[PDB]
Amino acid sequence: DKGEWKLKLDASGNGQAVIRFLPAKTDDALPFAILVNHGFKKNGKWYIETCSSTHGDYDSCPVCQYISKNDLYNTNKTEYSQLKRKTSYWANILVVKDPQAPDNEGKVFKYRFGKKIWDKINAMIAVDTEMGETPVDVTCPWEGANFVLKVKQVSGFSNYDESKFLNQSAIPNIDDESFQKELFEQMVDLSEMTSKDKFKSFEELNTKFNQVLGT
Numbered sequence: 001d002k003g004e005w006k007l008k009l010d011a012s013g014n015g016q017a018v019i020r021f022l023p024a025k026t027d028d029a030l031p032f033a034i035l036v037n038h039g040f041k042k043n044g045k046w047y048i049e050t051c052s053s054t055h056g057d058y059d060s061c062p063v064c065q066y067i068s069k070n071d072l073y074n075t076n077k078t079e080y081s082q083l084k085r086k087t088s089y090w091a092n093i094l095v096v097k098d099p100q101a102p103d104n105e106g107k108v109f110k111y112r113f114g115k116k117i118w119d120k121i122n123a124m125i126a127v128d129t130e131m132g133e134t135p136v137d138v139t140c141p142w143e144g145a146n147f148v149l150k151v152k153q154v155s156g157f158s159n160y161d162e163s164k165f166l167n168q169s170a171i172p173n174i175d176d177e178s179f180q181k182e183l184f185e186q187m188v189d190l191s192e193m194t195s196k197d198k199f200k201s202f203e204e205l206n207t208k209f210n211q212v213l214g215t
């Protein structure tokens with residue numbers, strides 16, 4: 001009821017589903033949105049904000065400024081790991097199979113994910129064409145491929161190692177214009193996730209950052 005789809009886990013902490021990453025909503029759009037941010041707690045307070053480096057602006061981020069000016073990477077590894085920028089991704093997807101919530105099947109939602117899954121998408125296209133490997137754009141409605149989402153609790157964390165892409169396949173009914181029109185219709189504007197309004201001014205961030213660090 002918000003537009004975002006999530007994999008629902010069981011008591012054991014297991015989850016599986018089949019999703020289909022969708023292509024760019026428009027010709028000048030991208031199938032993925034890249035977002036960077038910071039998230040850490042200090043003095044009983046949380047600093048959870050987007051990082052202006054998402055669009056190459058490190059100056060407008062107080063954390064990056066702090067990390068850099070204090071050479072934390074070299075003077076305090078620990079602190080560095082806690083405060084370092086974190087990259088995630090957004091995409092539009094078509095839920096194929098969702099055992100835990102069958103009502104999602106056949107619908108389009110925005111889906112967020114990390115490097116572990118992003119690499120699987122890229123490993124499909126960044127192949128060795130010198131050895132004859134066939135690249136595959138998994139987001140193509142005709143020659144893309146469904147992705148099986150598998151989660152398992154490993155060492156207390158959600159592990160996605162078993163997630164993988166299946167064989168290439170065209171989306172069913174994709175040739176039907178009405179279906180195709182509705183599919184792209186339900187896709188949300190991914191650039192919206194990285195627009196200017198998603199970043200607070202430097203002064204506001206710095207103010208919050210300082211209260212979190214106690215300055």
Ligand SMILES: [Zn+2]
Pocket residue numbers: 038051052053061062063064065085
């Ligand atoms: Zn930053």
